[PDB]
């Protein structure tokens, strides 16, 4: 068991700043754990992942895709994840242009599909998975696929008729009309993806169970906005490794290499 907990944050080029910025986390953790903390910020994901693998980071904060890579190479466990919009998970919604006569995923056969950014989960990878798993529809092959830039652009492109359907974040679609981006009488929801996970905090499994248990309780109980605002989080809530299978499965289905 390390005398001082090595708590790594997201990788960053300005390590001194991000460490200073997150002093409220250091102070919150020392007081609540009764243990000294050393904050760590790595130049890239490979450094972080390998340093944890070899016992030189104790707790670490990852992106979900990054977490899945870290887990394949080392005995770690997630114990909390970022809460935003009331939970540590989110969905994608598929919407359809009302006038296009698309009533079901299957009807996207030979139609136009709007996606956000090639790299987005909520506006590309997730909605693409849904179409494949549910209707055996492959992008490029069984429908025409347009990448239009952002989540707002998906909603707009579907609503104004330039696509028949599109996939975006549930959360963002839910205020697209509120913000006046679209007429809500021109689109309807076809359905939702499963729940995908947010940024996990993860720890090395061979820390003592006394420490591990206490770590998890402390992080889950953080209510200090000065700590939380740096993660753009309302809270941290329990999460487990099993909550990232839906990402593993998405990798496979689409043939993604996370590096």
Numbering used by the authors: 5 to 263
Which sentences from the paper describe this structure?
Here we elucidate the molecular basis of high-affinity phosphite and hypophosphite acquisition by determining the ligand-binding affinity and structure of the PBPs of phosphite and hypophosphite ABC transporters from environmental microorganisms. We over-produced and purified PBPs of three putative phosphite transporters; PtxB from the globally important marine diazotroph Trichodesmium erythraeum IMS101 (Te_PtxB), PhnD from the oceanic picocyanobacteria Prochlorococcus marinus MIT9301 (Pm_PhnD)35 and PtxB from the soil bacterium Pseudomonas stutzeri WM88 (Ps_PtxB), as well as a PBP from a putative hypophosphite transporter, HtxB, also from P. stutzeri WM88 (HtxB)18. The structures reveal that ligand specificity, measured here by thermophoresis, arises from a combination of steric considerations and the interaction between a ligand P-H hydrogen atom and an aromatic π system in the binding pocket. The structures of two distinct types of phosphite-binding protein and a hypophosphite-binding protein reveal that a P-H…π interaction ensures high-affinity binding of specific ligands, representing a universal mechanism in these PBPs for recognising ligands with a P-H bond.
In our study, numerous attempts to crystallise apo forms of Te_PtxB and Pm_PhnD were unsuccessful, but a 2.1 Å resolution structure of Pseudomonas stutuzi PtxB (Ps_PtxB) in an open conformation was determined. Analysis of the conformational change between the open and closed, phosphite-bound structure of Ps_PtxB using DynDom42 revealed that domain closure is induced by a ~60° rotation around an axis that lies between the two lobes. This is facilitated by flexible loops that form the hinge region between the lobes (residues A85-T93 and Y200-Q202), as well as residues from the extreme end of the C-terminal helix (G255-L258). Superposition of the individual lobes of Ps_PtxB in the open and closed conformations shows that lobe 2 (residues 96–196, 0.35 Å RMSD cα) adopts a very similar structure, with the conserved STS-H motif (S124, T125, S126 and H155) spatially conserved in both conformations. In contrast, lobe 1 (residues 1–84 and 202–255, 1.55 Å RMSD cα) shows some differences between the open and ligand-bound states. The positions of Y94, which hydrogen bonds to one of the phosphite oxygen atoms in the closed structure, and D16, which hydrogen bonds to and stabilises the capping tyrosine in the closed structure, move ~7 Å and ~4.5 Å (cα-cα), respectively, on ligand binding. Y94 resides on the hinge region, the conformation of which alters substantially during domain closure, whilst D16 sits on a flexible loop that latches over the binding pocket in the closed conformation. In addition, the B-factors of the core residues in lobe 2 are much lower in the closed, ligand bound, conformation compared to those in the open structure, implying lower overall flexibility when phosphite is bound to the protein.
